[PDB]
Design a protein around this motif. Sequence first.
Motif, PDB file in Angstrom:
ATOM      1  N   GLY A  58       0.914  -0.834   0.247  1.00  0.00           N
ATOM      2  CA  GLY A  58      -0.018  -0.287  -0.401  1.00  0.00           C
ATOM      3  C   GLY A  58       0.991   0.843  -0.175  1.00  0.00           C
ATOM      4  O   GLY A  58       1.738   1.070  -0.324  1.00  0.00           O
ATOM      5  N   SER A  59       0.337   2.257   0.317  1.00  0.00           N
ATOM      6  CA  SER A  59       1.004   3.795   0.212  1.00  0.00           C
ATOM      7  C   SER A  59       1.609   3.866   1.884  1.00  0.00           C
ATOM      8  O   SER A  59       2.914   5.080   1.267  1.00  0.00           O
ATOM      9  N   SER A  60       1.291   3.560   2.668  1.00  0.00           N
ATOM     10  CA  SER A  60       2.232   3.282   3.657  1.00  0.00           C
ATOM     11  C   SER A  60       3.662   2.639   4.065  1.00  0.00           C
ATOM     12  O   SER A  60       4.611   2.670   3.856  1.00  0.00           O
ATOM     13  N   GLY A  61       3.626   1.034   3.067  1.00  0.00           N
ATOM     14  CA  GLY A  61       4.429   0.158   3.427  1.00  0.00           C
ATOM     15  C   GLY A  61       4.104  -0.391   4.398  1.00  0.00           C
ATOM     16  O   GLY A  61       5.277  -1.203   4.711  1.00  0.00           O
ATOM     17  N   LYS A  62       3.549   0.173   5.975  1.00  0.00           N
ATOM     18  CA  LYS A  62       3.759  -0.200   7.301  1.00  0.00           C
ATOM     19  C   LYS A  62       3.046  -2.149   7.370  1.00  0.00           C
ATOM     20  O   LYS A  62       1.528  -1.376   7.057  1.00  0.00           O
ATOM     21  N   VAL A  63       3.459  -2.532   7.555  1.00  0.00           N
ATOM     22  CA  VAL A  63       2.636  -4.164   7.625  1.00  0.00           C
ATOM     23  C   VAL A  63       2.594  -4.658   8.766  1.00  0.00           C
ATOM     24  O   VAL A  63       3.720  -4.405   9.802  1.00  0.00           O
ATOM     25  N   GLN A  64       2.189  -4.764  10.307  1.00  0.00           N
ATOM     26  CA  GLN A  64       2.537  -5.495  11.488  1.00  0.00           C
ATOM     27  C   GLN A  64       1.633  -6.564  11.214  1.00  0.00           C
ATOM     28  O   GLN A  64       0.174  -6.824  11.204  1.00  0.00           O
ATOM     29  N   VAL A  65       1.661  -7.927  11.929  1.00  0.00           N
ATOM     30  CA  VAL A  65       1.358  -8.971  12.114  1.00  0.00           C
ATOM     31  C   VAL A  65       1.251  -9.137  13.518  1.00  0.00           C
ATOM     32  O   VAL A  65       2.030  -8.470  14.631  1.00  0.00           O
TER      33      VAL A  65
END
Length: 114
Positions: A58-65
């Motif tokens: 996405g636009s952010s790149g923030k991935v959180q598991v």
Amino acid sequence: ATQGVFTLPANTRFGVTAFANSSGTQTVNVLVNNETAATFSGQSTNNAVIGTQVLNSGSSGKVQVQVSVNGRPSDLVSAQVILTNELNFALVGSEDGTDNDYNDAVVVINWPLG
Ligand SMILES: [Ca+2]
Ligand SMILES: [Ca+2]
């Protein structure tokens, strides 16, 4: 420190795959830009794959598991590794109990794809 949060180059596809090693049933959620984008569940004492999916950063790149077991958040550990300045792994382990093997649910994110 915060664990399970990774910044990926934006609008880039990535894989995420989860494995289970616990008597408790594991639930893994994946948040892309703070929105739930995939969720896996299963139980295995034998490293079985409980889910896998290609996503986009996405636009952010923030991935959180996130990992929980019957509702109880597991304690996370994570790191990112880059091989030959190109191939990226984001790694997550988790502990739902006391033996601190931290493999109860194991999650692997990798990119680039294709
Ligand atoms: Ca454990
Ligand atoms: Ca275990």
